[PDB]
Symmetry: D2
Subunit: 268 residues, 4 copies
C-alpha cells in the first residue's frame, strides 16, 4: 500500500533522467500515484525519457511563458485524467536563467531583459501554474515547488538567487490563494543534485572555473550536513517531495522544507 | 497504511488523552509502530490513559531530571523491546516551567532557580534523552521534539519562550551527534493544542487571563493560517511527527517543521 | 560637528515632502552632508519640493528604467559635486508596482509584464544604481536602500512583497561587489510611513489599511510606532551612511519600533 | 561634538585591555560619554586595566550571580553618578561557560549544573541587569548586549551557542519591559575578536586543536565578509555598540545588529 495510492499528480520539469522531476515522478509512481507529466520545448526527447519511468503517463506541452499553454492546461489535464476527476498534487520543478545572470559573468552586467526572463520562468510561473490548476484540484491537495536556499548570497548563483528569493515570497502568497480550495503550497529547498541545469546552466556559466563549483558544493553541503550529502542521489529529495504530496504533512503550508542533509543548520 | 510498519519508537510525554504525545502514539500505532512509552511522576494515572490507545505498550518511568532514570533508560528499553533489537524513533514531547516564569507574573520576577528548572526539563533534556538512546538506535532512525515558535516574543509564554529558543539550538547540536549514528534530529513547531500544559500557562483552566489566551491563540493562528487551525485537533501535529519518524524525510536534520496551518508564514 | 560632516551623498526618491527620501535628505543636511538629489518624471514638481529642504542641492533626472540616464549618471554627478571628488553615500529610496499587483486586485490576475516592471524599478534598480555609482565612491562609503519586511505574506502588498524579497537578495550581492571598493550596502526595513506610495497600495478600503498598519506595527512595537513621523527612519538611514556602523554590510536594519520582534 | 555627549552609560565586562567592553568604553569616552564601570571577581586587576582608559570612571563590583550585588546595584550607581541623575545607556558584555560545555569536550557530557551556570551568566543576567537598572534609566535610553550568531550550530562553541540562542530570546522580552520606560534593548552580534574569553575559554577547551581551528575561523570570516574581518581590531564592534547607545537608531528594539563584516549574509 503506497504513500500516494490513487492520487493524481501533475509533474512538470523533466528533461533528462537526472532531472529532479524525473526522480520525483519515479518515486511518486512507485508509491501508487497516477501521473500527468508536462514538458518544455523538446517533447520528442522528453517522451523517450519518460518511457524509462516505471509506468506510462500522458505528457503535455507546457512552456510557462506561453499564455495559451496556460489557458488550455486545465482543459488538457482534465482530458488526460478523465472528465470529472481532479488533481491531488502538482509539482513545479522548473527554472531558468540566462548565462549573463550566472557564473563568472559579472553580476552587474546582466541586463534586466535577461533577469526578467529568469524570474518569469523560475518564480512567477509558480503562481501561473497554481492559477491554472487550483480550479481542478481536490481539497487535501498539495502544490510543491523546488527551491535552493537563497537567504545568503553565494558565488555564481547570482541572479538565480534573486529569483529563488522571489519564489519563496510567491509561495507564501500562493498558499493564501490555495487555502481557499483546501490546498497546501510548499517548497522543497534541495541540496545540490547533478542535473542538466547544474552543469549546463551553472557549470557552463563558470567556464574554466567548473572545478570551483564542485569544491564549493562540497564545502557548503557534504561537509556541513550532519548526515552527509550525495550530489548523485536525487532519491532523498524526491521522497521529501512525495512526503509533501501525501496526507502526512497536512498542517504545513506557505513553507519551506529543507532536503539538504541538514547543511543549512550548520555554520561549518 | 503502515507508514511505520515494524518500527520501534519510544514516546515520552503522555499525561492525559489530550497530550500531544498521546495522539502521536495513537497515530504511530495506527501506522504499524511498536511503541515503548515513558511517563513522569503519575504512572498509575498514565497507565489508565495509555490503555485507551489502540494497542498495549510497555510503560517506563522517566523523570528527565533524574540521573539514575537516564543511566538505566537504555537498559530498560532493551528489556522491553527484546534483547538485540533497537529503536528506530524517539519522541521528546516534554516541557515544564514554574508558574513564576509564565502568564501575568512579571518577566523580571522569575528567579533563576525556577527558570533553570524549566530549561533543564524543556531543553537540556532533549540532549540527555538523545545521549541515553542513541546507543540503541538503528541507522535511518529519527529523533523528534516539540517546539513552539520562539523567534518572536509574545505575551504570557515568557520564559518558556527562552527555553524553546534554547531547545532549537540544542536540536542543531544533537543533529551533529546523531549524524554519527545515521540518525536525524528535528523539532515540530506545533500550533496551539488544548492540553493540560496549555491551561498551566495562565494558572489552570480558569486563570484570570484564560479568555485573553483564547483570543490571542485565535488571532495568532486560526486567523493567520491559510488552511486554518483547530486547537482541539492534535491529529495534524501527530501526523507531522510520524512523517519525521518515517523514511519519507530522509534528508532533513537539525531542523524545524512547522505544523501550524501556515500561520508563521503570514503577518496578518 | 554633525554626523555626516563633509560627506557627499546622493539621495534618490523624492516626490513630495512626505517622501521618506525627503526626510532622509533633510536630516542628512542637518547633519552636514552635501547632497546630490535625483528625481523621476515630474522634475518641475520635485524642484519645488526640494526647495523646502534646509539647503540647496543639485537635482538630476534619473528614471532607473532608462539605460542612457544610468550610463550618464556618474558623469553628471561628478560635474555637480566637482571634478576629482567622489560620493561617500548613496540612498535608493525608490519603488513602483502597477495597480494590478496590489490591493484588492487578485494576486493571480497580475500579468507578468506588470510584475516585471515593478521588480525592475523596485529591486533590479538597486543593482543598476550601485553599478553606475561605485566607480565614483570613496572607500568607507555606504549604499542604503529602503525595504519593507517581506519575510511573511500580508494583505494588499501582494507583488510588492515579492519585489522586496528580491531586493533583499540583490542587496546581499551588491554587498559583494561593493566590498571591492571598501563600500557597505544595506537596507533599512522601515515601519509604515504615510507617503504618496502608501496611498497607491489601495487608491485613497483606506480604513482597513490603517487598521492593519496599527495592528501590525504600533500595537506590536514595544516603543510604539507613529506613521506620521519619518524622522526615526531618516535617522536610521543616516546612521548607516555614517562611520558608526562600519562592520555591517549585506544586511537589513529594522526601523519599525521593534514590531518585527513581537508576535502579538 | 561627540556622538554620546553628556550621556551616562554603565559598561560591564572589562577584564583585560582586549575585552570588547574595554574598547566599547574607550570609544564611548572618546565620544563624550561619562561612564560607570562594573567588574567581576578581580577588581584589583580591573582597576589597573581601567586606568588605561582615556578618562577616569568609577568602578563597581558586580557578579551577576550574586543577588545582593544586584539588589544594591541601582543604589551604588546613583551614588556614583550623582543623586538625581540617571543612566542613558547600559552595556552587558558578559559571558561564561564551563570547560565541559565547550571545545572538544563531547556535547552530551556537559552536566546541567555546568550548562545552567553558563546560561545564568550569559543569558539570564541580561534580564537581571535590565531589572536592576531600568528604574534609573532615562527615556530615550539604550541597553545593549553582546551576541555571537547562534542560528546555526558550529564546532566548539557548543553549549555557549545554546546560551546565546537563549540570550536572543531574553533580549526580545527585555525590549517589552524596557518599552514601558521608553528604552530600547538590542544585541550586537560581533564577529570574532581576540579576547581572554576566546583564548582561555574557547581555546583552552579546544586543547591541541586550538591553533588550527582558530586560524581557519579567522580565514573563513574574513573570507565571507564582503568588507573583510580583522580579529585583532575591536573598534568596529565598539563603534557599532556606540551607534546603538546613541540617538541615531531610535526605532530599533528587540533586535540584533550584526557587526561581522557582513559574514552572516554570505554562505560562501
Ligand atoms: N540541481 C540542483 O541541485 C537543484 C537544487 C535545488 C533546486 N533546484 C531546482 O529544481 C528545479 C529543477 O531543476 P533540475 O536540477 O531538475 O534541472 P533540469 O535542467 O533537470 O530541469 C530544469 C527544467 O526546467 C524546465 N524549463 C525551463 N524553462 C521552462 C519553461 N519556460 N517552461 C517550462 N519548463 C521550463 C526545463 O525544460 C527542465 O525540465 C529548479 O527549480 C531548480 O532551481 C536545483
Ligand atoms: N499544546 C500546545 O499548544 C503545544 C504547542 C507546541 C508545542 N508544545 C510542546 O509540546 C510538548 C508537550 O506538551 P503538551 O501540550 O502535550 O502538554 P502536556 O501537559 O500534555 O504534556 C507535557 C508532558 O511533560 C511531562 N514532563 C514534565 N516534567 C517532566 C519531567 N521532569 N520528566 C519527564 N516528563 C516531564 C509531563 O509529565 C507531561 O507528560 C511540550 O514540549 C510543549 O512545549 C505544545
Ligand atoms: N512608506 C512606507 O510605509 C514604506 C515602508 C517601507 C519601505 N518603503 C520604501 O521606501 C521607498 C520610498 O517610498 P516612499 O513611501 O517614501 O514613497 P514615495 O511615493 O514618496 O516615493 C516613491 C519614489 O519612487 C520614485 N520612482 C518610481 N519609479 C521610479 C523610477 N523608474 N526611477 C526613479 N524613481 C522612481 C518616485 O518618483 C518617488 O520619488 C520605496 O522603496 C518604498 O518601498 C515605504
Ligand atoms: N570575542 C569574541 O569573538 C566574541 C564575539 C561576539 C561576542 N562575544 C561576547 O562578547 C562578550 C564579551 O566577551 P569578550 O570577548 O569581550 O571577553 P572577555 O573575557 O573580555 O569579557 C568577558 C567578561 O565576562 C565577565 N564575567 C564572567 N562571569 C561574570 C559574572 N559572574 N558576573 C559578571 N561578569 C562576569 C568577565 O569578568 C569578563 O569581564 C560576551 O558575551 C561574549 O559572549 C565575544
Ligand atoms: N532549473 C534550473 C536552474 C536555473 C538556473 C540556475 C540553476 C538552476 O538549477 C539549479 C541547479 C543546481 C542547483 C544547485 N547548485 C547551485 C550551484 C551554484 C554553484 C556554486 C555552489 C553554490 C551555487 N551549484 N549547484 C540549483 C539550481 O537552482
Ligand atoms: N509541556 C509544556 C509546557 C510547559 C510550559 C509552557 C507551555 C507548555 O506547553 C505548551 C502549551 C501550549 C502552547 C501553546 N500556547 C501558547 C500560549 C501563549 C499564551 C497565549 C498566546 C500566546 C502564546 N498559550 N498556549 C505551547 C506550549 O509549549
Ligand atoms: N515606492 C514605492 C512603493 C511602490 C509600490 C508599493 C509600495 C511602495 O512603497 C510603500 C508604501 C507603503 C508601505 C507600507 N505599507 C504596506 C501596506 C499594506 C497595508 C496592509 C498591511 C501591509 C501592506 N500599507 N503600507 C510599503 C511600501 O513599500
Ligand atoms: N564571555 C564569554 C564567553 C564565554 C563562553 C564562550 C565564549 C565567550 O566569548 C566568546 C569568545 C569568542 C567568540 C568568538 N568565537 C567563536 C569561536 C568558536 C571557535 C571555533 C569556530 C567558531 C566558533 N571562537 N571564537 C565568541 C564568544 O562568545
Amino acid at each position: 500500500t503506497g504513500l500516494l495510492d490513487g492520487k493524481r499528480i501533475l509533474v512538470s520539469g523533466i528533461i533528462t533522467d537526472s532531472s529532479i522531476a524525473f526522480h520525483i515522478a519515479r518515486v511518486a509512481q512507485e508509491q501508487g500515484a497516477q501521473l500527468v507529466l508536462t514538458g518544455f520545448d523538446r517533447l520528442r526527447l522528453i517522451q523517450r525519457i519518460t518511457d524509462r519511468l516505471p509506468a506510462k503517463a500522458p505528457l503535455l506541452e507546457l512552456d510557462v511563458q506561453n499564455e495559451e499553454h496556460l489557458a488550455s492546461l486545465a482543459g488538457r489535464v482534465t482530458e488526460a485524467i478523465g472528465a470529472g476527476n481532479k488533481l491531488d498534487g502538482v509539482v513545479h520543478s522548473i527554472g531558468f536563467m540566462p548565462q549573463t545572470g550566472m557564473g563568472i559573468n559579472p553580476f552587474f552586467d546582466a541586463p534586466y531583459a535577461d533577469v526578467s526572463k529568469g524570474i518569469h520562468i523560475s518564480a512567477y510561473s509558480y503562481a501561473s501554474m497554481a492559477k491554472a490548476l487550483l480550479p481542478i484540484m481536490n481539497p487535501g491537495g498539495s502544490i510543491v515547488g523546488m527551491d535552493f536556499d537563497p537567504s545568503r548570497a553565494m558565488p555564481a548563483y547570482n541572479w538565480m538567487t534573486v529569483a529563488k528569493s522571489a519564489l519563496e515570497s510567491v509561495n507564501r502568497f500562493v498558499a493564501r490563494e490555495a487555502g481557499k480550495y483546501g490546498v497546501r503550497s510548499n517548497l522543497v529547498a534541495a541540496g545540490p543534485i547533478r542535473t542538466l541545469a547544474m552543469s549546463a546552466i551553472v557549470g557552463g556559466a563558470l567556464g574554466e572555473e567548473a572545478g570551483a563549483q564542485i569544491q564549493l558544493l562540497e564545502e557548503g553541503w557534504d561537509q556541513r550536513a550532519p548526515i552527509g550529502w550525495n550530489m548523485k542521489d536525487a532519491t532523498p529529495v524526491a521522497k521529501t517531495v512525495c512526503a509533501l504530496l501525501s496526507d502526512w504533512l497536512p498542517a504545513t503550508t506557505g513553507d519551506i522544507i529543507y532536503a539538504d542533509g541538514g547543511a543549512h543548520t550548520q555554520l561549518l
